Amino acid sequence: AAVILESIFLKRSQQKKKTSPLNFKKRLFLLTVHKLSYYEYDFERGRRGSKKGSIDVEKITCVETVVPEKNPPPERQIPRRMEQISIIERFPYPFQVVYDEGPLYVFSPTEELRKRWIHQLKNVIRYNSDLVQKYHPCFWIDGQYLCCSQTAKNAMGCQILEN
Amino acid sequence: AAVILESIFLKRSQQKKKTSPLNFKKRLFLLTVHKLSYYEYDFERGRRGSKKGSIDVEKITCVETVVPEKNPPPERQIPRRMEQISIIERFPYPFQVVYDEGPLYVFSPTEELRKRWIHQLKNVIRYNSDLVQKYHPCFWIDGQYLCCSQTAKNAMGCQILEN
Amino acid sequence: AAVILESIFLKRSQQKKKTSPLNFKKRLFLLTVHKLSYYEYDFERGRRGSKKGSIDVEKITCVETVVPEKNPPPERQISEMEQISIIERFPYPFQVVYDEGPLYVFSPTEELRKRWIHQLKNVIRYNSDLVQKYHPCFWIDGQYLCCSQTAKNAMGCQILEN
Amino acid sequence: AAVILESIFLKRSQQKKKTSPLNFKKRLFLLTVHKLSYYEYDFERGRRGSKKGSIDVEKITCVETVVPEKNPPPERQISEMEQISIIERFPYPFQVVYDEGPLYVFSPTEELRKRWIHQLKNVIRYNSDLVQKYHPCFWIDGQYLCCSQTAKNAMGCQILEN
Numbered sequence: 148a149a150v151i152l153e154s155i156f157l158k159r160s161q162q163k164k165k166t167s168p169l170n171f172k173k174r175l176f177l178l179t180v181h182k183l184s185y186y187e188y189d190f191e192r193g194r195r196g197s198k199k200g201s202i203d204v205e206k207i208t209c210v211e212t213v214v215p216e217k218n219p220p221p222e223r224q225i226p227r228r229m230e231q232i233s234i235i236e237r238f239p240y241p242f243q244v245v246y247d248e249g250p251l252y253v254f255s256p257t258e259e260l261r262k263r264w265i266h267q268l269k270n271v272i273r274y275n276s277d278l279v280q281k282y283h284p285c286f287w288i289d290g291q292y293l294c295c296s297q298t299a300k301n302a303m304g305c306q307i308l309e310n
Numbered sequence: 311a312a313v314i315l316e317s318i319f320l321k322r323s324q325q326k327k328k329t330s331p332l333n334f335k336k337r338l339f340l341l342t343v344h345k346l347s348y349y350e351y352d353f354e355r356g357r358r359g360s361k362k363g364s365i366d367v368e369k370i371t372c373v374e375t376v377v378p379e380k381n382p383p384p385e386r387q388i389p390r391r392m393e394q395i396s397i398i399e400r401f402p403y404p405f406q407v408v409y410d411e412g413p414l415y416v417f418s419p420t421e422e423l424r425k426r427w428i429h430q431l432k433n434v435i436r437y438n439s440d441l442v443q444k445y446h447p448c449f450w451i452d453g454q455y456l457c458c459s460q461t462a463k464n465a466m467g468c469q470i471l472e473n
Numbered sequence: 474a475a476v477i478l479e480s481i482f483l484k485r486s487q488q489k490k491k492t493s494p495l496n497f498k499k500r501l502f503l504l505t506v507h508k509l510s511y512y513e514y515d516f517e518r519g520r521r522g523s524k525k526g527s528i529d530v531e532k533i534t535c536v537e538t539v540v541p542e543k544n545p546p547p548e549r550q551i552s553e554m555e556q557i558s559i560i561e562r563f564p565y566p567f568q569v570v571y572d573e574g575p576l577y578v579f580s581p582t583e584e585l586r587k588r589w590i591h592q593l594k595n596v597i598r599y600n601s602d603l604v605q606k607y608h609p610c611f612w613i614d615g616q617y618l619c620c621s622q623t624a625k626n627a628m629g630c631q632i633l634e635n
Numbered sequence: 636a637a638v639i640l641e642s643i644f645l646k647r648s649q650q651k652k653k654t655s656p657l658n659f660k661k662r663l664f665l666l667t668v669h670k671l672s673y674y675e676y677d678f679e680r681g682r683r684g685s686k687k688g689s690i691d692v693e694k695i696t697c698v699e700t701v702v703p704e705k706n707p708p709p710e711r712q713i714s715e716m717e718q719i720s721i722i723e724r725f726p727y728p729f730q731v732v733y734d735e736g737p738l739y740v741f742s743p744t745e746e747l748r749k750r751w752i753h754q755l756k757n758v759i760r761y762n763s764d765l766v767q768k769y770h771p772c773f774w775i776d777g778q779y780l781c782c783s784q785t786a787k788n789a790m791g792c793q794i795l796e797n
């Protein structure tokens with residue numbers, strides 16, 4: 148369909164599979180009313196590459212900011228003070244797109260960008276059937292969730308954000 | 311003025327003073343357009359007692375839920391399954407009323423109640439001049455904030471909740 | 474034994490002592506089978522304070538409603554649920570009668586009454602002295618306006634059959 | 636030395652070799668005082684890849700705009716800021732001329748050009764051979780349509796004074 152948005156972010160490994168590393172990839176993310184998908188980016192040629200995953204827009208229970216990790220390495224750190232480059236190498240503002248399998252973590256290089264996305268994603272998911280009301284505002288890491296130490300990657304959020 | 315709300319909650323020590331313990335008190339909380347105030351409760355006689363603090367409604371930068379502590383003792387635990395009593399002895403749903411001096415933490419015995427309050431408090435603070443946009447969704451405890459480990463009790467929130 | 478109930482009613486002075494004035498105290502009531510007890514409530518620590526009374530279930534003769542008195546002071550004026558009202562307003566005055574006489578416990582709400590009474594019955598039900606005429610009326614100012622008669626333990630101007 | 640700039644322009648083949656076809660590569664340009672260099676960009680690791688060229692600043696004779704060619708293929712078609720467009724669209728073709736000849740670097744945006752050029756000048760400014768007639772025109776298909784003349788390093792059909 149149409150592309151609502153398209154940006155380059157740094158996403159963390161969903162680690163769907165056991166043997167998978169916890170790592171980050173620069174990916175070109177798209178968004179249609181249908182899905183949220185991400186592809187390898189072919190910078191040389193300038194084009195989207197091989198698809199590396201999607202999440203169907205309707206299976207989405209929730210989308211929000213995530214509490215930034217405490218000691219992020221520079222690729223996701225906030226500087227002090229050339230953007231065109233930085234905006235494709237430094238992604239410090241994460242957010243979370245949660246669904247049945249768990250949460251996909253996505254870092255954005257600017258806030259506005261993150262804002263932009265969360266919002267559309269919101270619009271997009273407004274009438275979904277499973278919009279959860281409790282989420283985890285912290286990352287899932289090393290076996291469990293910081294915020295509540297629960298271990299089920301798709302555990303119930305330990306917090307209700309209600310207006 | 312009018313009372314918008316009145317409930318009994320279990321509040322944690324603001325510890326404004328150095329020599330102060332980190333502890334909880336059952337307090338009768340009120341809310342007018344002017345302030346948010348809390349008093350000792352005189353249960354025998356059934357009346358509000360001596361005032362023990364307020365926070366001026368306009369100095370309020372923010373109000374939200376807080377991520378529940380991981381191992382709360384029973385007075386703030388969620389049961390399994392007589393309410394009239396429980397609702398004055400068990401307060402497991404906290405929330406945070408933040409202002410210049412820091413955050414006041416307030417536990418509510420039910421969610422609806424917490425809902426109710428956060429909302430009015432919201433209305434009440436809608437046109438305030440300092441409504442912060444970043445908060446700490448976790449408690450301040452033992453010297454710093456869990457969510458971001460910052461130590462300034464009135465540190466900048468490490469998270470932006472934007473719709 | 475094992476509690477069977479537990480609530481916070483208001484209760485008028487039993488006046489057992491000649492000195493005793495009449496007044497109401499907010500108390501925390503329990504229920505087992507053996508007895509039915511009330512304490513001072515540690516609102517602050519949120520817990521049961523000093524025992525202030527007991528009535529053995531066995532000596533219970535008549536668990537029953539009483540008659541919402543005429544002009545309940547606020548306190549007692551008009552299951553219901555105000556976190557605070559419900560521990561500050563008990564307009565459903567009931568009555569437990571026993572050897573010594575009748576205990577006047579008040580309720581913030583009906584389901585609450587029901588709940589107790591009923592339960593009361595479950596527990597006295599096999600007693601040895603379930604009287605069958607009673608004073609749905611109060612005992613007051615010197616005498617039961619049930620039957621203007623005067624012995625607290627005066628016999629009941631009314632009968633409740635079934 | 637100390638970078639003075641750093642960007643990602645597109646750049647047409649210098650064709651130094653007879654084999655060399657003409658094409659454009661996305662490259663990462665730096666700037667110091669000594670030289671001006673371009674590399675392959677490690678987009679994935681987000682970093683500077685293999686060096687693909689250098690031009691000594693000193694041998695710089697003429698830093699200057701060139702002439703937006705006729706029918707820029709998308710790629711080059713129409714400071715500006717699309718996270719992606721700005722690293723995918725460089726329509727502001729400029730030119731660095733030196734001994735060997737002229738290097739055709741393209742820009743996604745004007746402030747970006749300006750920024751470089753200017754800076755360029757700061758750095759060649761005291762050179763020993765700042766020529767003063769140039770070919771705002773391209774060198775193409777066999778010959779500079781600046782002056783239809785043919786030596787790459789052909790002398791400039793135009794002068795830029797000040």
Ligand SMILES: O=P(O)(O)O[C@H]1[C@H](O)[C@@H](OP(=O)(O)O)[C@H](OP(=O)(O)O)[C@@H](OP(=O)(O)O)[C@H]1O
Nearest residue numbers: 159160161162163164167168170171172199200
């Ligand atoms: O490239 P290597 O070093 O194998 O590691 C990968 C990447 O992080 C993947 O991201 P992408 O898919 O973006 O390549 C991730 O997939 P997701 O994070 O998309 O799931 C894979 O996890 P699994 O989820 O275990 O497949 C993980 O194995």
Ligand SMILES: O=P(O)(O)O[C@H]1[C@H](O)[C@@H](OP(=O)(O)O)[C@H](OP(=O)(O)O)[C@@H](OP(=O)(O)O)[C@H]1O
Nearest residue numbers: 322323324325326327330331333334335362363
């Ligand atoms: O009763 P003790 O054992 O002294 O401890 C108190 C109570 O927690 C107070 O609550 P309340 O005011 O509700 O009594 C608290 O005030 P706040 O939490 O209101 O500030 C005091 O902290 P300071 O903030 O340090 O005064 C703390 O000293």
Ligand SMILES: O=P(O)(O)O[C@H]1[C@H](O)[C@@H](OP(=O)(O)O)[C@H](OP(=O)(O)O)[C@@H](OP(=O)(O)O)[C@H]1O
Nearest residue numbers: 485486487488489490491493494496498525526
């Ligand atoms: O506290 P003060 O003002 O002294 O009055 C007391 C309380 O009403 C007692 O209730 P509680 O025990 O619930 O405090 C009542 O006991 P009962 O429990 O027998 O009513 C006392 O009378 P006596 O009944 O006379 O002891 C009465 O004097």
Ligand SMILES: O=P(O)(O)O[C@H]1[C@H](O)[C@@H](OP(=O)(O)O)[C@H](OP(=O)(O)O)[C@@H](OP(=O)(O)O)[C@H]1O
Nearest residue numbers: 647648649650651652653655656658660687688
């Ligand atoms: O990669 P392929 O298709 O082989 O083509 C190359 C690139 O355009 C070179 O650019 P880069 O070095 O930027 O890759 C260019 O070098 P210049 O940098 O001299 O343009 C080469 O020509 P020569 O100029 O003939 O070497 C040209 O053949």
Ligand SMILES: [Zn+2]
Nearest residue numbers: 283294295305
């Ligand atoms: Zn959690």
Ligand SMILES: [Zn+2]
Nearest residue numbers: 446457458468
């Ligand atoms: Zn924080």
Ligand SMILES: [Zn+2]
Nearest residue numbers: 608619620630
């Ligand atoms: Zn009678």
Ligand SMILES: [Zn+2]
Nearest residue numbers: 770781782792
């Ligand atoms: Zn020319």
